[PDB]
Every structure is written in structure tokens, then in C-alpha cells.
């Protein structure tokens, strides 16, 4: 497609409200009010009430940003790669094509197109064929931190996030959340007053429990 096809779609959209937006929606959708706060869930039984654990689909949140663990290239893949784009529809992919790819360690932004989410940050993730070394470590934070400097730029209230470079990328999954959840911790401490959430996007039951466990750790007293 011609790129004034993404342009203007992507203006038509960044100016719709919540209630314009839901009337498109071909989906229902999880609004950001339905996914309990850390310190919501705790009182079920401070920073608790800026982060959430989030077990479904990424694709279904009306965020102001999902992450999306991209490769390289930015034109997708497998995974929730793949499911991004399909759901986003090939708006996405004409303005990821404008981008020319992303480096390692490296963000870039684009508009959500049909997804509920305004927009889609993209990040690389480090690859670990072998054992995880100073510079997969040092990358898998870059993408946290590079990702969050897009959040602060672009006035995004409301983000989630994959476990980049786990699975497939080799990242094993517990380092990875240490990785993740003392980024995103740094990050809150001089930023709090510009997010209303941090949700970690957890499908699986080995990384549901690794955050799970953590989370007080990170974000309590």
C-alpha cells in the first residue's frame, strides 16, 4: 500500500476518543479499569498501584501502548509477532516497512491501527544461542529502557509488556524478570506521576509465577 493510506488512517485514529474508537472495535476488548493493580490484588487477601500481571492475550488491551517483541526487520513473524500484526490489520506493517528495521536494544513507535491499543512500541530483544553473556543482559535492558523513553515521549498513561527475548531468543525466563522488573522499577521512581500502569503481559504459568513472586520484592514498602 501507498504510505498516505497508513498516514491517514493513522491521523483519522490518534484523533478519535475512547468512545469513538469502541464503536469501530470488531472485537471486544479488556479496558485498562478491568485489570486489577498489584496493590488491588494484595488488599484481595507505593508503586503497587502503577504495575498489573495480565494472563491473556496482548492484542485485546485498550492501552495507550502494547510492546510488541519484534525482530530486526520491524515486518513481523511468529508468535505474538504475528498476532500483533493480524489483529492490528497491514496498516502496521506498511508503517513498520517506513521505518527501516530497529537495532537491537532499540524502540521504535507506531499507531495500533485496529487494535484497541492508540499505539504499538516495538522492540528487538537480544538472541542467545548460547549461554546469556554482559551483552545480552546489558540489550534485554536497553529494550525496558528504550521502550519506556518512547512511553515518556509520546504521554502513554497505560503500557504492557511481553517477556522479550524469552522462548525462542533463549533469554532463560527468571533473569529476564529480574531484568525487566528492576528496569521498570528505576524507570518508576523518577516517573510515576506520568503512567497510571505498567502491565506485565504473563501467558504462560512459568512466567506468571516468576512475576508473581517478585512483584512484592520490586514495588512494595
Given at each position: 500500500?501507498k ?8 491521523e483519522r485514529?490518534?484523533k478519535?476518543?475512547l468512545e469513538e474508537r ?5 472485537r471486544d476488548y479488556?479496558?485498562l479499569?478491568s485489570?486489577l493493580?498489584w496493590?488491588?490484588e494484595?488488599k484481595?487477601?507505593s ?6 500481571l495480565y494472563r491473556?492475550?496482548?492484542t485485546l ?8 517483541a519484534?525482530?530486526?526487520?520491524l515486518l513481523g513473524?511468529?508468535?505474538v509477532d504475528?498476532?500483533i500484526?493480524?489483529?492490528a490489520?497491514?496498516?502496521l506493517?506498511?508503517e ?8 537491537t536494544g ?5 499507531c495500533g ?5 492508540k499505539?504499538?512500541?516495538h522492540?528487538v530483544?537480544?538472541?542467545?544461542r548460547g549461554?546469556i ?5 546489558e540489550?534485554l ?5 528504550s521502550?519506556?523513553?518512547?512511553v ?5 498513561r497505560?503500557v504492557?509488556?511481553?517477556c522479550?527475548?524469552?522462548?525462542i531468543?533463549g533469554?532463560?525466563n527468571?533473569?529476564?524478570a529480574?531484568?525487566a522488573?528492576?528496569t521498570?522499577k ?9 503512567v497510571?500502569r505498567?502491565?506485565?503481559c504473563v501467558f504462560?504459568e512459568v ?15
Amino acid at each position: 500500500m501507498k504510505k498516505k493510506v497508513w498516514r491517514e488512517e493513522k491521523e483519522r485514529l490518534l484523533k478519535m476518543t475512547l468512545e469513538e474508537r469502541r464503536k469501530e472495535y470488531l472485537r471486544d476488548y479488556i479496558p485498562l479499569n478491568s485489570i486489577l493493580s498489584w496493590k488491588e490484588e494484595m488488599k484481595g487477601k507505593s508503586l503497587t498501584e502503577k504495575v498489573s500481571l495480565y494472563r491473556g492475550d496482548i492484542t485485546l488491551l485498550e492501552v495507550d501502548a502494547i510492546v510488541n517483541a519484534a525482530n530486526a526487520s520491524l515486518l513481523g513473524g511468529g508468535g505474538v509477532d504475528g498476532c500483533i500484526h493480524r489483529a492490528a490489520g497491514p496498516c502496521l506493517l506498511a508503517e513498520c516497512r517506513n521505518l527501516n528495521g530497529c537495532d537491537t536494544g532499540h524502540a521504535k513507535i507506531t499507531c495500533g491501527y485496529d487494535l484497541p491499543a492508540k499505539y504499538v512500541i516495538h522492540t528487538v530483544g537480544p538472541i542467545a544461542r548460547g549461554h546469556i553473556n554482559g551483552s545480552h543482559k546489558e540489550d534485554l535492558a536497553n529494550c525496558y529502557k528504550s521502550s519506556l523513553k518512547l512511553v515518556k515521549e509520546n504521554n502513554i498513561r497505560s503500557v504492557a509488556f511481553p517477556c522479550i527475548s524469552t522462548g525462542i531468543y533463549g533469554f532463560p525466563n527468571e533473569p529476564a524478570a529480574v531484568i525487566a522488573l528492576n528496569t521498570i522499577k528505576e524507570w518508576l521512581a523518577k516517573n510515576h506521576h506520568e503512567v497510571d500502569r505498567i502491565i506485565f503481559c504473563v501467558f504462560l504459568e512459568v512466567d506468571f509465577k516468576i512475576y508473581k513472586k517478585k512483584m512484592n520484592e520490586f514495588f512494595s514498602v
